[model samples]
Target: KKKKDKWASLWNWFDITNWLWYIKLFIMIVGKKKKK
Candidate 1:
């Protein structure tokens, strides 16, 4: 089974605003941690 389907299911549980903010925060922290 693919994990993408799980992501779609999970996304369906939230609003676009929540997903956008979460991705922004998550990517920002990840990018900062790498510091490359």
Candidate 2:
């Protein structure tokens, strides 16, 4: 269990990065649709 948590903790850094892409893409697509 400790090993699994260590791996998970390492991966957690990507989680913070992931939100930016999600927000950017969502805004871009929605803005395009609204413009059309």
Candidate 3:
């Protein structure tokens, strides 16, 4: 139960905007490289 709760909190803290920001940054880097 403690481990379950820990993962639940981890997911809650790692919500969509955080992931989106990372994906957006990744795309920006790739786009910059392709433009070169």
Candidate 4:
């Protein structure tokens, strides 16, 4: 019900794969062991 939600909805419709890529990249940047 705010800007945050607005952005999320936009990105989700744009491409869900984007989220997968970002999730992995975020984990890698933090040096948190990624999926095996």
Candidate 5:
């Protein structure tokens, strides 16, 4: 049970980072289109 909890926390960090990166890329693409 303890080992599972430790891995779960690490997974949360990776998940959040992935979403943040995704959102950043999305904004960059949209911003370029608007600039033109």
Candidate 6:
């Protein structure tokens, strides 16, 4: 149950934007930050 809620929250954040490009850009930025 806890794992399911976490997945739901993650989907919510990714679904917040209208443009697919914006979501891709956001994920790219997050990936860069993680690499640093």
| Number of the predicted model whose TM-score against the real structure is largest | 2
Better of 4 and 6 by lDDT: 6
- The alpha-carbon lDDT assigned to residue 24 of candidate 5 equals 96
Model 5, 1-36: lDDT tens digits are: 255588788777887888999999999999999996
lDDT of 3 by residue, 2-33 (tens): 55577777677668648888999999999999
> Could you tell me how far off, in angstroms, the CA of residue 16 lies in candidate 2 after the best superposition?
2.2
Position 1, candidate 2: lDDT: 23
| Predicted candidate 4 versus true structure: per-residue lDDT over 1-36, tens digit per residue | 256677777666667668789988888877755434
Cα lDDT, model 6, residue 8: 78
* Ranking according to lDDT, highest score first: 5, 2, 1, 3, 6, 4
| Between candidates 3 and 6, the TM-score winner | 3
Name the top lDDT candidate. 5
The stretch of ten residues in a row with the least summed lDDT in candidate 6 is 1-10
Expressed as tens digits, the lDDT of each residue in 1-36 for candidate 2 is 255577687687688688888999999999999984
Clashing pairs in 4: none
- Evaluate model 6: give its TM-score: 0.43
Error of 2 at 29 (Å): 0.5
Across residues 1-36, which tens digit of lDDT does each residue of candidate 6 receive?
Answer: 255577777677675646777878889999999995
My TM-score estimates for the predictions, one after another, are 0.48, 0.50, 0.46, 0.40, 0.48, 0.43
Error of 5 at 23 (Å): 1.0
Off by over 4 Å in 3: 1-15
Candidate 2 whole-model C-alpha lDDT, 0 to 1: 0.81
Backbone clash tally (model 6): 0
